[PDB]
Amino acid sequence: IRRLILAFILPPAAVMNKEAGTIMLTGILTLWGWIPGVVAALIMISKEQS
């Protein structure tokens, strides 16, 4: 949906729920290539649901 698209495009943008420090982790993982940030975003966006 919109949030999955946001995670694929700007992984920090989709993940604004979690924490003040987790968002830096997602952002810097996005800085390293682009796959680590997306992976973190999907992992912590499927963790509150699954």
Partner 1 sequence: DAAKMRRFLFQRTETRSTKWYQIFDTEKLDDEQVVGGHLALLGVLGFIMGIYYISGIQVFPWGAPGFHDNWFYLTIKPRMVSLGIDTYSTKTADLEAAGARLLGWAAFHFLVGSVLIFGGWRHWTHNLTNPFTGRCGNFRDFRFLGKFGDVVFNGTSAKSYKEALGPHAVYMSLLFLGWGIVMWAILGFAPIPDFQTINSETFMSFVFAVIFFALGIYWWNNPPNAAIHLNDDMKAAFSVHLTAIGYINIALGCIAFVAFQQPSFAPYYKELDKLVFYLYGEPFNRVSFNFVEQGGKVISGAKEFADFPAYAILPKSGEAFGMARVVTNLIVFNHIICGVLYVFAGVYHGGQYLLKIQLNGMYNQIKSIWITKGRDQEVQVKILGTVMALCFATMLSVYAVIVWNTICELNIFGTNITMSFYWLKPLPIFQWMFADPSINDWVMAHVITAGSLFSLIALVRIAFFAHTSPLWDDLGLKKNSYSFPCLGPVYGGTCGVSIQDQLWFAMLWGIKGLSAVCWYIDGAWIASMMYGVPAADAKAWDSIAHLHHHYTSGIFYYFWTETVTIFSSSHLSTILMIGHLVWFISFAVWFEDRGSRLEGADIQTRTIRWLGKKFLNRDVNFRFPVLTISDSKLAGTFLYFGGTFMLVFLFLANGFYQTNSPLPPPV
| 34: its two tokens | 């682009």
19 is a site residue for partner 1 (CB under 8 A): yes
32 is a site residue for ligand BCL (CB under 6 A): yes
21 is a site residue for ligand BCL (CB under 6 A): no
22 close to 36: Cβ distance less than 8 angstroms: no
CA distances from 29 to 6, 21, 48, 49 (A): 15, 13, 20, 22
Which of partner 1, ligand BCL, none sits in contact with 21, Cβ below 5 to 8 A by type? Answer: partner 1
| Residue 21 Cβ vs ligand BCL, minimum distance, rounded to whole Å | 16
